[PDB]
Every structure is written in structure tokens, then in C-alpha cells.
Amino acid sequence: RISNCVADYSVLYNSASFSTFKCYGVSPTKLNDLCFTNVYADSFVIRGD
Amino acid sequence: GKLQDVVNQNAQALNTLVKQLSSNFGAISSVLNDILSRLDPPEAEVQID
């Protein structure tokens, strides 16, 4: 659970290392102009397809 | 009553018209400025429509 931070998604997005960046209900580049109550970060590893 | 009922009918028709703005009609949010504020135009277009 991440909260009380200035989430700089613009730096995170423009990195070419990421192979899939798909956002639903929010455009991937306007995220830097919105404020959020709490952001949950889930992480795991799966296969490609 | 013949004079009060027309005033009440018009006031209630206007009140229903105003309340219709809080409906989503299938959009992710009824507030037009917020969906324009978080979705990019090419995909915000349908939520607007």
C-alpha cells in the first residue's frame, strides 16, 4: 500500500524498459495531473502469453 | 389549485431535468469535467457520447 507520496508517473512511463503499460479508466500520460486517495501496488511473475 | 398545480408541474419537470445530470447513462462518471480530466480524447470520446 502506497500513500502520501508525490507519485511521478511521468518519469516512470517514459522508460523504454517496460514492455507492457496498459491503463484502464485513466489515460497513461494524464496520470500526472490527478490526485489519488491510496494506490495499491501488486507484484508477481507470470509467463508471456 | 388550478394555478398552483401548473407551477408545481413546471418546477418538478425542471427538477427532474436537473437531476438527469447526475446520471451516468453508462459512462464511468457523470461529471463531464472529470472524465475529460482523466481520459485521453480518443477513448474519452465514447464516454462523452
Next chain:
Amino acid sequence: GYQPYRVVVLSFELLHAPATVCGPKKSTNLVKNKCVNFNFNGLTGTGVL
């Protein structure tokens, strides 16, 4: 297609609740009694304050 992929899913909540994580847009001074386009912690709009 079968190589592993690390996946992080960021979930954003947007309830009628206090916001805490905000994109790092610098704050500005407040002007009252003027028609301005405001953005209060993610709530956007145009009006006189």
C-alpha cells in the same frame, strides 16, 4: 511468448474521501472573486471562488 514477465498492477481508488497521493504539480497562490479555472487535489472546474 513463454519467457517470464514481471508484472506490477497499480490500482487507483477514487472515492468521496480525502486525497493523499498527488502528482507533483507545484501549488500556487489563491485568487478570490475572479473567474478562474481551478484544480483542487484532482477536482477540476471553472468558476469564481
